Amino acid sequence: NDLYRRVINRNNRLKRLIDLGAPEIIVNNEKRMLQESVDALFDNGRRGR
Amino acid sequence: LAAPVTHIWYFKGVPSRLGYLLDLAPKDLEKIIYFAAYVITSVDEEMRH
Amino acid sequence: ALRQARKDAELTASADSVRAYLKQIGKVALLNAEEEVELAKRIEAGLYATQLMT
Amino acid sequence: VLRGSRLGAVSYETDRNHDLAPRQIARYRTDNGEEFEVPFADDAEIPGTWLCRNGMEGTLIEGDLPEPKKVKPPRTHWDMLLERRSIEELEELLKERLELIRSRRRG
Amino acid sequence: FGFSEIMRSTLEKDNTVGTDEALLDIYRKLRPGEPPTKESAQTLLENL
């Protein structure tokens, strides 16, 4: 539930930033965070801490 | 998802199956999918020539 | 030299997400009060301009 | 000894198949053309819109209801600007910026 | 280390002369990705 909640939290915030029209530094940081949260859901500790 | 995400099983674990299919080194693939470098998806040869 | 040692450290892996973000945001100068006033005036002018245009 | 309950009930009934209440089937359609069937009870009021299996609302397929209206955001950047400026002040700012770009490009 | 042919050989084969150059060579791999500033490179060993 914690891993699924991280995926949902970062996905909803990315939707907010895209419809807010934020700069690409913020949007790319959000996308990289979403990618790392889905990776930690599937296989935790395989890539990184 | 509001942005596409790669599966960790097909990117990371040796041998990198995504790297073998697309012919990219794993170090050059990590930089793309974790937002540290750009990749040229397409080029135009008639207009350039 | 120290130039080349700066640039070779400038393009690296940085496989930690916090460190990558901090390196990315530490590449723009700060602002002073009259510059902030100029930017705010430009924002308001452009916003009224697009409302007027639509 | 630890003893926990996932907070639900288990009933002891015989699952029959014959004497069941009547049902009617509605059909909905989302904004990308998908279609879904929902079994409502026969003595029940069919709603106009339904949240389907894509997670997007679909309108009822029978052309009866003029229901959805505007629920507009009262908070945009233009609204936040307008509550602290005036039209003449913004017009003066716009004309000053226009004169600066005329003096820059044209002069 | 005047008694050691090991130390004389590894002094000759290092191809790096100068304290500032050596501090640069250490700093380039100790904290990779950070630009080498002079005071930070000079105090990295002491504060480590």
Q: Is E27 exposed, middle or buried (0-12, 13-18, 19+ CB in 10 A)?
A: buried
Round to whole Å and give the CA distance between D63 and C2.
74
Rounded to the nearest 5°, which phi and psi values hold at A48?
100, -160
The encoded tokens of residue E41 equal 């490179």
Of D30, D76, D81, D72, which Cα lies nearest the Cα of D53?
Answer: D30
Q: Least CA distance to C14: which residue of chain B?
A: B36
β-pair partners for D57: D51
- Pick from B1, B7, B13: which is nearest to A11 by CB? B1
Question: Reported resolution in A?
Answer: 2.7
Which among A6, A24, A29, A46 is the top mutation candidate for probing chain C, defined by the most C β-carbons within 10 Å of its own β-carbon?
A29
Q: What single letter denotes the amino acid at residue D9?
A: A
Beta-carbon contacts of residue B39 (< 8 Å; ≥ 6 apart): B32
Quick one: how many helices (H) and strands (E) in chain E?
3, 0
Please check whether residue E32 touches C, CB under 8 A: yes
Q: Per the CB < 8 Å rule, is C51 touching D77?
A: no
CA dihedral A36, A40, A45, A48 (to 10 degrees): 10
DSSP character string of chain D = ------S---------SSS---EEEEEEE-TTS-EEEEEEETTSPPPSEEE-TTSSEEEESSTT---------S--HHHHHHTTS-HHHHHHHHHHHHHHHIIIII-
D85: distance to nearest CA of chain C, Å? 9
Q: Do C19 and E24 touch (CB under 8 A)?
A: no
CB atoms within 10 A of CB D42: 9
CA angle D34, D37, D38 (to 5 degrees): 130
Q: Which residues have C-beta within 8 Å of that of residue E34, sequence separation ≥ 6?
A: C9, E27, E40
CB of D37 within 8 A of CB of D27?
yes
What technique solved it?
Answer: cryo-EM
DSSP conformational letter for B41: -
Q: Which of E34, E39, E42 to mutate to test the interface with C (most CBs of C within 10 A)?
A: E34
Chains D and E share 3 or more Cβ pairs within 8 Å: no
> Would strands D49-51 and D35-41 be described as parallel, antiparallel, or unpaired?
unpaired
Angle subtended by helix axes C33-53 and D87-101, to nearest 10: 100
Tokens of E7: 């130390």
Q: Which two tokens stand for residue C25?
A: 């945001």
Q: Do A36 and C17 touch (CB under 8 A)?
A: yes
B30 touches chain C (CB under 8 A): yes
Pick E35's closest partner by Cβ from C9, C13, C19. C9
Q: How far is B18 from chain C (nearest CA, A)?
A: 19
End-to-end CA distance of chain B: 40
